[PDB]
Structure 1
Amino acid sequence: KKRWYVVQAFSGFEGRVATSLREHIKLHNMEDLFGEVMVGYVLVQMVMNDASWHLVRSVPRVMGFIGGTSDRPAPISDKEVDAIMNRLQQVGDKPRPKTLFEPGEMVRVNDGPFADFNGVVEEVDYEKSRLKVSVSIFGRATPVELDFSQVEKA
């Protein structure tokens, strides 16, 4: 059984640290002691022998593990485990919006010259994915069409 651990790298060289780590594994052929490597912190499926600990800290541009102590470092205590699996699916099938708009509902604009302005959606168009909202510019309401992502629900 291989449990997870957290590795600190020089922040910015993280993909190169991950590649060098996979290559040090396939050099010193402790292939049965490493499962994956996930991407300034690098997640490693691993077991704990002192040989594998020296291996990961002998990988270049790696500071060390992050745990309670340096004798027996600590398995990443990820509170979200099965929830993190669903959070990876959430980032994967990105939850997107088509035309979040409603009559008389106030909205917020954060894109184009109308950004930083609020208004109401007098008309909505889910088929055209466009919301009809006017902005109080110099007093007169300025009915303009904004996308659901172009404006926020108020």
Structure 2
Amino acid sequence: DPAAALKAELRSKPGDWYVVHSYAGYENKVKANLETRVQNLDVGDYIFQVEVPTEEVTEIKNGQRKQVNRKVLPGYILVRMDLTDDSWAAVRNTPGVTGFVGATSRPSALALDDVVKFLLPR
């Protein structure tokens, strides 16, 4: 089962997946800027992976069957890391990030089931 396989894979890799909210269309841009700032700011031992889940849906717009690549979760990015005082700022200060999405006030980490459900090619 791909679900079980990815569960096993993501179990070992370090970090906890968090959710970041951006300005709607600033998703690939935010990913690129964050992956560049992770090297420029030397916080590469805390931030490990940035994912923007997408999936392709065929649409017959104007009578034209086209497989356009949509975004599963529009306006959110998935970041695997260990939250600290430096990582939090390095993420929250990326141009195009609206801030972390948390449960009550502080950042909350997704469960492996949810992240597997969206990092699996749809």
Fold shared per TM-score above 0.5: yes
Higher relative contact order (CA 8 A, sep 6+): 2
The structure with the largest alpha-carbon Rg is 1
Instruction: Give the unaligned 5+ runs of structure 1.
Output: 92-154
Cα distance change of structure 1 residues 80 and 42 upon mapping to structure 2, 3 Å threshold: closer
**Structure that is richer in helix per residue:** 2
Aligned to 1:50: 85
Q: Is the 8 A contact 2:43 2:86 kept in 1?
A: no
The C-alpha deviation readout for 1:92-148, integer Å capped at 9, x for no partner, is xxxxxxxxxxxxxxxxxxxxxxxxxxxxxxxxxxxxxxxxxxxxxxxxxxxxxxxxx
TM-score by length of 2: 0.63
TM-score by length of 1: 0.51
Question: Equivalent residue for 1:31?
Answer: 44
The CA RMSD measured in Å over matched residues stands at 2.0
User: Residue type of the partner of 2:99?
Assistant: G
> Distance in 2 between the 1:54 and 1:69 partners?
19
CA deviation digits over 1:7-61, x for unaligned, max 9?
Answer: 0000112100100000110101111111111011000011110111011011111
Aligned: 1:22 with 2:35: yes
The residue aligned with 2:109 is: 75
* Percent of matched pairs sharing the same residue: 37
1:80/1:56 CA distance change after superposition, 3 Å: closer
Partner of 1:88: 120
> In structure 2, what is the equivalent of residue 59 of structure 1?
94
Unpaired runs of 5+ residues, structure 2, are: 1-13, 53-74
Q: Equivalent residue of 1:30, what SS?
A: coil
One-letter code of the match for 1:88?
A: L
1:77 Cα offset (Å) = 3.6
Find 1:10's aligned residue among 7, 19, 23: 23
Q: Aligned letter for 2:36?
A: E
- Aligned partners of 1:75 and 1:18: how far apart in 2? 18
Runs of 4+ in structure 1 off by over 3 angstroms are: 77-82
Distance (Å, rounded) in 1 between the aligned partners of 2:115 and 2:50: 16
Give the partner amino acid of 1:34: I
Give me the whole-angstrom Cα distance separating, in 1, the residues matched to 2:115 and 2:29: 27
